[PDB]
Design a protein around this ligand. Structure first.
Ligand SMILES: *[C@H](O)[C@H](C[C@@H]1CCNC1=O)NC(=O)[C@H](CC(C)C)NC(=O)OC[C@@H]1CCC(=O)N1Cc1ccc2c(c1)OC(F)(F)O2
Ligand SMILES: *[C@H](O)[C@H](C[C@@H]1CCNC1=O)NC(=O)[C@H](CC(C)C)NC(=O)OC[C@@H]1CCC(=O)N1Cc1ccc2c(c1)OC(F)(F)O2
Lengths: 306, 306
């Protein structure tokens, strides 16, 4: 029995029309062209022999508008003339002569651990794929990025408005990925320099495990449900000792509780037991807890609620 | 350690620009607008009290061009006047007065079990999400489709050319999904009528399990590799008894063998052993064989080869 759950991304067309190639000498990556501004990672300015410890302030001052080449390849080809440049945190803000005529309605937002967003993976300014990820508790994502993907963008969508939340910067030693918000801050404690960096311990996202257990119930799979209950306060003390995020309920989780008639606290109890072992049983085809689906995913994909 | 593998879809913008709403009385679903033609499921013609056994030939003859309303909502709104109608298998081919100015370069192809394709899930002619699936050996997909999603399209991409391979029609009792190719034939033995239908037994896609084991090796995870080997012929006799597809090698699998230096036959042997049990070990975070990633996925996402 298939749960009806897939890794669902937003349609990517609105964002595809904003992607450009940014080159600064022998360095090339992707940028995001909104209005008269092109956002890209600041290490486009860095030569390779300096990626391990750039002085980005001195690199910035050494740039001229002439130093940057911006090109659009897909759909409406163009060379964009750079007329201003500035640095915000780990991003460059280039000002260009032409406003993107396909600029969608948009905002900049930061994404929180456990929340999902869509990524448009791009190489040389050309969109090549799209996928969805959850921000992990250690501020990494389990993405799929290769050399040249920096500047690829992550976003969510509220109606027609695109909320840009991620610009790709780096790959960590364990194969996960991280980047910047559009305020220029890196997620987590990471720095945009090519040095091994301590990364924090990941955790299970409790709210997303609860969501998945509700998805299972919505599919007729409820062997793990008991009248036994664990309170949120007690579960959260357990979580701290057992590599779980503390649980914080939301209206989306409450809708699942109402639809199924199973209380959150019954699933917090179940999580405690299932963490010790599934005892040879499966939940939605899995022998391990799943935390890559959000309450909103379950409401939308199974219940048709947005 | 993350494998670097995600469920990757093609960017969807080219296809988003081809989606329309098709209505025939009290029935509404999605269609695909290419050139002067709109493709949609033929059960748009069916009233609800007849979905269990339509006479599609008589329904067809009862239609007029007046009977169909075609609308585009996103990007370049329009009402398309229908000037001809015809039925091919389980699809309608409407001829409309306006050629889609955003028609991409395209072909129609059929997808084979084990092969992956991207789906653009649409409701009322509006794209709402995108995801990627593998055609299962029983000619179903493990999708995420709700009421009103019929007419959503699946496709692959070779360069700039979109190969349309799927139009969504139905949900089976076990929660999986199926639809039509654009020659109008349903995948599998299924029929586009609202009746319980026997569905065939699914199987593990051996070639995709091999691909995943290579992905594991490419990530430094090779505990399951032994010098022991099972020949393709012998494995395929085993597969028939154990719910696996017979293995057929491809150049993409051979590239993985060359890169890793592990022979296909070593992984066929491993599959036989792992099927009996992982003995408490994990492969890329999993305690079960994974067949949802193709050799091409592994070559592209991990090795950067297209
Ligand atoms: C930009 O296009 C590019 C994207 C990378 C390339 C490979 N996949 C990606 O996502 N970014 C960088 O190459 C980046 C540029 C800096 C200026 C930010 N450098 C980078 O990732 O450098 C190595 C990285 C920095 C932080 C860290 O711990 N490392 C070392 C490291 C060690 C072992 C690794 C690894 C990274 O990735 C690994 F594959 F998982 O194994
Ligand atoms: C078109 O928009 C729609 C798409 C469906 C709706 C729910 N999710 C989808 O993907 N198609 C239909 O509703 C389709 C129209 C026919 C004219 C083809 N009918 C349909 O799916 O009817 C039920 C189906 C036909 C084949 C079959 O075995 N069934 C019965 C059945 C029984 C139990 C089910 C189930 C389907 O889906 C389930 F949820 F998994 O449980």
């Amino acid at each position: 029995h298939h749960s009806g759950l897939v890794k669902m991304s937003h349609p990517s067309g609105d964002v595809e029309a904003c992607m450009v190639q940014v080159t600064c000498g022998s360095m090339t990556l992707n940028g995001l062209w909104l209005d008269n501004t092109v956002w890209c990672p600041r290490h486009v300015m860095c030569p390779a022999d300096q990626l391990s410890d750039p002085n980005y302030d001195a690199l910035l001052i050494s740039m001229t508008n002439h130093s940057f080449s911006v090109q659009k390849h897909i759909g409406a080809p163009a060379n964009l003339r750079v007329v201003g440049h500035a640095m915000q945190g780990t991003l460059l803000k280039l000002t260009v002569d032409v406003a993107n005529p396909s600029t969608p309605a948009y905002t900049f937002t930061t994404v929180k651990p456990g929340a999902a967003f869509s990524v448009l993976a791009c190489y040389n300014g050309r969109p090549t794929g799209t996928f969805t990820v959850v921000m992990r508790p250690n501020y990494t994502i389990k993405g799929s990025f290769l050399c040249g993907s920096c500047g690829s963008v992550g976003y969510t969508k509220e109606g027609s408005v695109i909320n840009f939340c991620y610009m790709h910067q780096m790959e960590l030693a364990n194969g996960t990925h991280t980047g910047s918000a559009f305020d220029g801050t890196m997620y987590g404690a990471f720095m945009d320099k090519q040095v091994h960096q301590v990364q924090l311990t990941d955790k299970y996202c409790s709210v997303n495990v609860v969501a998945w257990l509700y998805a299972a119930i919505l599919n007729g799979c409820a062997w793990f449900v008991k009248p036994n209950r664990t309170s949120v306060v007690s579960f959260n003390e357990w979580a701290l000792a057992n590599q779980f995020t503390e649980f914080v309920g939301t209206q989306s989780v409450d809708m699942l509780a109402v639809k199924t008639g199973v209380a959150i606290e019954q699933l917090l109890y179940a999580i405690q037991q299932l963490y010790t072992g599934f005892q040879g049983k499966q939940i939605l085809g899995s022998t391990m807890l799943e935390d890559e689906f959000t309450p909103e995913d379950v409401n939308m994909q199974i219940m048709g609620v947005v």
